[PDB]
Nucleic acid binder design. Structure first.
Ligand SMILES: [Zn+2]
Ligand SMILES: [Zn+2]
Lengths: 362, 98, 80, 94, 107, 98, 81, 95, 108, 362
DNA sequence: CAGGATGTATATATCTGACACGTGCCTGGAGACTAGGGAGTAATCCCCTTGGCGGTTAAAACGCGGGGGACAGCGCGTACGTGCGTTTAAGCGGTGCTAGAGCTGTCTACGACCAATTGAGCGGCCTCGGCACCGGGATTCTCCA
DNA sequence: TGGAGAATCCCGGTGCCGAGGCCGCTCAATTGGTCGTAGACAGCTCTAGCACCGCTTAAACGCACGTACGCGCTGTCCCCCGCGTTTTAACCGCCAAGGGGATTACTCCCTAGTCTCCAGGCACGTGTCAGATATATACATCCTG
């Protein structure tokens, strides 16, 4: 029933009112800090914040003791060396560079040492944190497995912020993305060309350890395109605003998202199925969704059982070819085990057949 | 008075559009008239395809605009703003063309 | 039959503007006319000599390409 | 009955290799064809003069690589040396 | 009883010809014999340089927000590099344009 | 006072004798020191005959004295008498060497 | 063996420029001259090293130097040519 | 072993006596002349190569030599060389 | 048989080697067949040119009141002619000297 | 007897006193005229008088109704084309001339048309003669066989002057003159080199008509060398002046010269044996004369019979190889017939055995 | 400064003609073999390059005066930027046509190639002649009156 | 105007050495005979150079307005140049030594060349889409007051 969905939606809205104050103090202090970064001499002179918006549909969020702000940094000519032949991760090397790139001491031979730059970046950020202490801020040293520099802030509550560096690249738009992002018929090739004219990112994240290089393996990142396609989801692109026929796409988005949030926080065996899964899932649903009539609050329940049906259909077929990378079928047993998926289907059936019992609470 | 523009200003926008543009600034007819005029000296009674003529216009325009930038920089080092013949002469001189 | 005055002064002005010029002395037009004339004489003399040993009555472009090449003025986009 | 050879085939091959997303005005096609040919002419005449200095009757890739080094700008030469050496050693193992 | 063709371009794992090239080599009146690895070496260096050019070409072109390749892009890219312009100084380009530039004293 | 010569005068007779002369004006020792100094960068441990060294001194002297006359004429067109670096820069510029 | 670049004595430069037909000699031009002279030398000697190396000699002849000038379009005579 | 080398100094001295037998000569300038002779011949030879290429010819004749020098040399000089060449070849046809 | 060996240069009435020239031609790796008069043609060309050279060379030399030859007067005669200088523009000469001239502006 | 030689010498001196006044008026008016030539625009802008001195030993003279003044005119690069393979006459052609020689209309193709320039020169000289008439001067038109422009002058007596153009040439010093002028042992190679460093002339004179070109055949001319070797005849070069031992060389020179003058004026069959014959004869006598003791007024008669003996020895041998041109044996029957030489020997014997009867007169 | 008018990037829609595929063909590249002779190396030798030790003398470096050429600045005058209306000649399309470049055959002189023998020029020794070179008188020279 | 050393040209003798002449000899030219073929005519077929003929239209020119750019000039002020002192260090010649390039033989390998099949590019033809044209909106600028 859509009324229970609106009440939990309003719960998310009240939580968003808490996150406004909290994350706004957070956004101002990292804006201050990043301002300090540009006057501080480094190889990170030009490193500015990558905004993705502030909404729950605009930042990937959890427990109030954690936050995330995306940072951008431009990069010169970069060759793309695949090690993850599924198509999800690459290596980090340059091109010719006649001028001479000022990171040779950071260059492991020809590869780029993500370890050294992350080390020195944590060094200079803690250096600057102890240089000026207007607001109560300190760097937290967590385990060297997740390269997200957490900054504990005692204003107003203990708000940590996962500082992560994303690299602005105009390099290639690789061959893995050739037959990626199909919007030719449903949306248009015109926009698609304009979109692929723009830059892109890669996130340094230590994947599965079947590799010589850990941390120096980097996953693809296109968050600008994701916020673009977020504000341009419907067949009429002027939607999510007052001028279009208001759908339930962001609605069902947050529903399934925080359903899975509550589901992993109450079933702690299943944690690998991160946020990107449902994102590529709804992308493929959309590319097979031709009609807008099946996306509206009147059809909210119909379209939501439709979404459940589509996702469970992808599970039984065991194929989820990625949107940007259809060669990379992210439904691979090597990273996400089968029996986990079976119990995941069982928890979906639990939520399904019992009138969604984890949302009678608030 | 109302929009009467100062010198160089108009020329600045012109130079902007020009260095942005690539096409030619020549009416090809008197140009190829002079082509056959120079040609007939050595030998008259010869035909030609227009492709070669356009190639001539291209290469000539290219060479002269290169000279334009060189003589421009020459007058720059000469600390002036208006052209003169002596810089052009010295340009040809330094390349050994005279 | 002169045609050298056919290169109109404002065309020359436009060309010089494309060459990046602020102010333009009024004497330089016949100067550049003569200099470009000399240049064309060199090129056309080479191309005619080519055309002669080519036993042709018409003139092609590839001879001109060889002329520019031998004058160290290497250009593409016209075949070859 | 006037088949002529060109390199637009291989140009388009290498093009789609590094960038399979681009059209071209065919002017540039012949530009690069003529270009690479002229380059190779410099190389061939050069290696000819070398083999003359070396009083040799044929040409291998050692003289080629040295003439390259003699003629090319900076680290590009070392790059191309790596490229050629590794591809020839690869090809010998075939 | 044939041994159906595996191209020497594929046998060196490249796009550029080896047969056509080697033909042009012998039919160039350079040498009577020509070593077999010399076309391989050649085709490799030239293909490498070719791709290097075409890389920056596509770079410029997409920066210019165009669909096909025009000379202007090529002239820009060539002159926006030392080693290219070092090795390609006196070449000239039809419809290539000039690098826009003005001395600060002219302002 | 008695025979203290004016500027340039002595230099005029010098220029007369110099343009009449052909020999070199260089002590060859520091020159070839710099030769091996530049040489060792690319590779050290190499010998040479003095003939090539004299050829180097010759060709270098020739190139620089050509530049001297070019920069001289450049300053002439610049309507001055003392040298400056900008003419030299523009000389290299017009030849495309910079 | 260091600071041989300052072995280029200023009066040598002065006499050289006198043969070059100049009249008054600004005090700054000597290090400019040294640098431009130096990069010219380097432009020669890189290819000269490459020459002798492909020539497999531990020594330097004059013919390589000649060929360097040739490829640089500065062809010289008087040493065999 | 001894490697008896080619030099045009014989023939240089021959033509020298053919015009100025009164005048003495050095050997440095002699090598200069020999070298320069070789250089211009190289220019003309590579030219004639590229030209016979442009006409797809397996052979090079005196007409091509004539056109090559004419394409290389300026004015009256070219005419005189044409005259000399034509004369001596026609002579040689009559032996 | 076995008549007296005779130079083809005598049959061209010139002072240049025809056998040596045609040999180096065939050692020059240019073509496949070589027109019989072409070496004679080129040789006659080269003879006329070197005559033109050594003429003015000795001219200049005697104008210096000299018997033997040095690169100075050679380079002078080069940089005095129009056609030859233009032909021999970028040529460099060991101890050739500079062609002396001074601008009237440099003069009082 | 030397006294009769001195009396006829003094007769020549009195005649020389007449020639002083006459030829001095002549020299001043042609100096005036030649001055007018330089301001008159022509291809003959620079045409100045070639002085050979004024003495009888310095100008070739005859009857007072004739005189001669040598004119010089510089010429550019000139190829020397021999037609007279004896070695006495050549053709008239230029060299390459990149600048462009301003005589193409006067150039018969490649040959030089001596006819046209001589025609136009006679034109401009008669033009100038009628332009200014200070002294009584007029041009005489004689037969077109001797290209000497005679100018009749009525001041004081009728003095004609044979205007002839000599061309100053720095061209070749031809191969005909290689083994010419041997002074290496008797005099010195040093001077010889210095002498051959200087220029030379060629006289346009229509030779024997076995030729296509008449008038355009030109004979060799070195009158500067002749006046040089005249003032430098002896082994001590300071002779003919007051500082050396006075010989009889100029003496015997004039003796034989005007002996032959009187001899042809009394025997009119023999006229081809012009002045140059005895000049080359005394040159060869000198190159075979090693001693100065046999050249002095005490040895005047001895040396004069010696000269007669040497010349008659050359006649019987029939060889007189020219001094500048030893290949050119000027004792050629084609220009000077044998029976003429025999009667010449007979007239020499006449003068010899009869105590020189043509000099008892005055 | 502010407005305002011009200049320019942005956005839509349209058409066309360039550009990517499709296909048949047959022209030159892989397969397989043999010749046979050019390049790689083995030993040797010889010459030549670098090291180095000791004078010498000319050149270079360093102090010093001076006037002069550069330069900062100041009036001026004109000619070159800025608009405008009139002529005009560049470009569009059509039509055509014909001379000339490409194709194909063929045959024919002609150069490539092998043998013997020769002499010429090239490596190396003798030699005189230009020819620096230092000395010593002749002749511009210019800064001073 | 001189003058007065200062450079700069002109004759003398002397080492000196090197340009040119002579001997041996070797390999490359010459002669003749062979053969395959390159081009030389010789016609036969499309195309594109000239040529015109109207027709439009923005470019050229001619005009006037004005200002600011070189030009000429004045003070002034370091900076090259002319001169002397020391130093310094480049040549002039020696010997060692070793090394490295030039030379021979032998072998090997690899391409030239033959012959066989195969597919690769090209000529041609179509379907579609990139941006020009035209229009219109919104901002960037300069210019005075
Ligand atoms: Zn919404
Ligand atoms: Zn006397």
């Amino acid at each position: 029933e859509p009324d229970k969905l609106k009440k939990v939606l309003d719960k998310l809205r009240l939580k968003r009112k808490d996150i406004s104050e909290a994350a706004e103090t957070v956004n101002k202090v990292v804006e201050r800090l990043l301002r300090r970064m540009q006057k501080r001499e480094s190889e990170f002179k030009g490193v500015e914040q990558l905004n993705t918006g502030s909404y729950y549909e605009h930042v990937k969020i959890s427990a109030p003791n954690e936050f995330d702000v995306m940072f951008k940094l431009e990069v010169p000519r970069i060759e793309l060396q695949e090690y993850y032949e599924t198509g999800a991760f690459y290596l980090v090397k340059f091109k010719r560079i006649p001028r001479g790139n000022p990171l040779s001491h950071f260059l492991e031979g020809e590869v780029l040492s993500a370890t050294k730059m992350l080390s020195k970046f944590r060094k200079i950020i803690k250096e600057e944190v102890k240089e000026i202490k207007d607001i109560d801020v300190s760097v937290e040293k967590e385990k060297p497995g997740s390269p997200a520099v957490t900054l504990l802030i005692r204003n107003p509550e203990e708000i940590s912020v996962d500082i992560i560096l994303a690299l602005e690249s105009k390099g290639s738009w690789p061959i893995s993305t050739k037959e990626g992002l199909p919007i030719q018929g449903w949306l248009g090739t015109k926009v698609r060309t304009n979109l692929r004219r723009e830059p892109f990112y890669l996130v340094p994240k230590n994947a599965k350890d079947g590799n010589s290089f850990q941390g120096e393996t980097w996953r693809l990142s296109f968050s600008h395109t994701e916020k673009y396609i977020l504000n341009n989801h419907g067949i009429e692109k002027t939607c999510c605003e007052s001028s279009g026929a208001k759908c339930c796409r962001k609605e069902c988005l947050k529903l399934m998202k925080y359903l899975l949030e509550q589901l992993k926080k109450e079933f702690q065996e299943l944690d690998a199925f991160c946020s990107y899964h449902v994102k590529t899932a709804i992308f493929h649903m959309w590319t097979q969704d031709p009609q807008d009539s099946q996306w509206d609050p009147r059809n909210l329940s119909s379209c939501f059982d439709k979404l459940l049906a589509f996702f469970l259909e992808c599970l039984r077929t065991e194929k989820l070819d990625h949107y940007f990378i259809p060669k990379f079928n992210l439904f691979s047993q090597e990273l996400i085990d089968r029996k986990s998926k079976e119990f995941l289907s069982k928890k979906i059936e639990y939520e399904r057949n019992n009138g969604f019992p984890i949302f009678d609470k608030l | 008075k109302p929009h009467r523009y100062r010198p160089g200003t108009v020329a600045l926008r012109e130079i902007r559009r020009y260095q942005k543009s690539t096409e030619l600034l020549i009416r090809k007819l008197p140009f190829q008239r002079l082509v056959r005029e120079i040609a007939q000296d050595f030998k008259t009674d010869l035909r030609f395809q227009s492709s070669a003529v356009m190639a001539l216009q291209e290469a000539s325009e290219a060479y002269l605009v290169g000279l334009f930038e060189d003589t421009n920089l020459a007058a720059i080092h000469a600390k002036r703003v208006t052209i003169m013949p002596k810089d052009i002469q010295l340009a040809r001189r330094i390349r050994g063309e005279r | 039959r002169d045609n050298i005055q056919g290169i109109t002064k404002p065309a020359i002005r436009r060309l010089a503007r494309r060459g990046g010029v602020k102010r333009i002395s009024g004497l330089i037009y016949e100067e550049t006319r003569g200099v470009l004339k000399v240049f064309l004489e060199n090129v056309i003399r080479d191309a005619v000599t080519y055309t002669e040993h080519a036993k042709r009555k018409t003139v092609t472009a590839m001879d001109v390409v060889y002329a520019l090449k031998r004058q160290g003025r290497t250009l593409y986009g016209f075949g070859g | 009955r006037s088949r002529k050879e060109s390199y637009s085939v291989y140009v388009y091959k290498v093009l789609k290799q590094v960038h399979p997303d681009t059209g071209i005005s065919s002017k540039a096609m012949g530009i690069m064809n003529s270009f690479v040919n002229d380059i190779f002419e410099r190389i061939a005449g050069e290696a000819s003069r070398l083999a003359h200095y070396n009083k040799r009757s044929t040409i291998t890739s050692r003289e080629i690589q040295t003439a390259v080094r003699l003629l090319l700008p900076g680290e590009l030469a070392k790059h191309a040396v790596s490229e050629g050496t590794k591809a020839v050693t690869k090809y010998t193992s075939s | 009883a044939r041994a159906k063709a595996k191209t020497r371009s594929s046998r060196a794992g490249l796009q550029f010809p080896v047969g056509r090239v080697h033909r042009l080599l012998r039919k160039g009146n350079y040498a009577e014999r020509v070593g077999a690895g010399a076309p391989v070496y050649l085709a490799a260096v030239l293909e490498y340089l070719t791709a290097e050019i075409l890389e920056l070409a596509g770079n410029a072109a997409r920066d210019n927000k165009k669909t096909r390749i025009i000379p202007r892009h090529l002239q820009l890219a060539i002159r926006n590099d030392e080693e290219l312009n070092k090795l390609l100084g006196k070449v000239t380009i039809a419809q290539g344009g000039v690098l826009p530039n003005i001395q600060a004293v002219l302002l």
